[PDB]
Amino acid sequence: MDKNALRKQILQKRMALSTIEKSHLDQKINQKLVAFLTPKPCIKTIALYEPIKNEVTFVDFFFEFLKINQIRAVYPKVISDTEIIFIDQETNTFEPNQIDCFLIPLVGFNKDNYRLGFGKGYYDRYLMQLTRQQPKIGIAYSFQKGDFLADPWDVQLDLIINDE
Numbered sequence: 155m156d157k158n159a160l161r162k163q164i165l166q167k168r169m170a171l172s173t174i175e176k177s178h179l180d181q182k183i184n185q186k187l188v189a190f191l192t193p194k195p196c197i198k199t200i201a202l203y204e205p206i207k208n209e210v211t212f213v214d215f216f217f218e219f220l221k222i223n224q225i226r227a228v229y230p231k232v233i234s235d236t237e238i239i240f241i242d243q244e245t246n247t248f249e250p251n252q253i254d255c256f257l258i259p260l261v262g263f264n265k266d267n268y269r270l271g272f273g274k275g276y277y278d279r280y281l282m283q284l285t286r287q288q289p290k291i292g293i294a295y296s297f298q299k300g301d302f303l304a305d306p307w308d309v310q311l312d313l314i315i316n317d318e
């Protein structure tokens with residue numbers, strides 16, 4: 155129930171995934187991503203992230219999809235203990251509303267699509283700046299569902315794409 159406690163739980167479970175099991179779960183999920191973006195050609199700049207503690211991985215055929223449809227990928231970079239910004243491969247910084255879609259990493263999400271991160275709350279602060287109704291999409295493994303209650307500052311997220 156408690157955020158901190160829930161983090162620890164899920165965190166331990168995700169670090170148990172088999173190298174083969176995980177690669178399969180990631181395949182199902184990446185396929186959905188491609189399925190999600192196909193009928194949305196107005197998404198030309200998209201925010202991704204660099205998989206860290208056994209987070210869902212973006213695979214090769216996903217990056218090929220973006221490459222072939224000319225969809226630019228931007229990644230997060232921290233500047234302070236509270237601020238995060240996004241940049242493209244050539245280190246060019248993209249403002250919040252220059253991005254059309256956000257694939258957000260997470261440790262947990264509940265039934266109302268709220269998400270749980272590592273605590274600093276970078277995304278809660280950042281996502282609050284969006285003014286173009288950009289989809290806010292959490293990326294996760296089915297078992298990352300958890301029963302915690304959202305705090306007043308938590309940005310809700312439009313959807314949670316997982317292995318199902």
Ligand SMILES: Nc1ncnc2c1ncn2[C@@H]1O[C@H](COP(=O)(O)OP(=O)(O)O)[C@@H](O)[C@H]1O
Nearest residue numbers: 157269270271272273274275276278279282307
């Ligand atoms: N928009 C905001 N303005 C000021 N502080 C914020 C804002 N959003 C989040 N925070 C702070 O960031 C921290 C995020 O905590 P929490 O939501 O539990 O983390 P996480 O999103 O990583 O699971 C909280 O201490 C909260 O007060």
Ligand SMILES: [Mg+2]
Nearest residue numbers: 269270278308
């Ligand atoms: Mg939060």
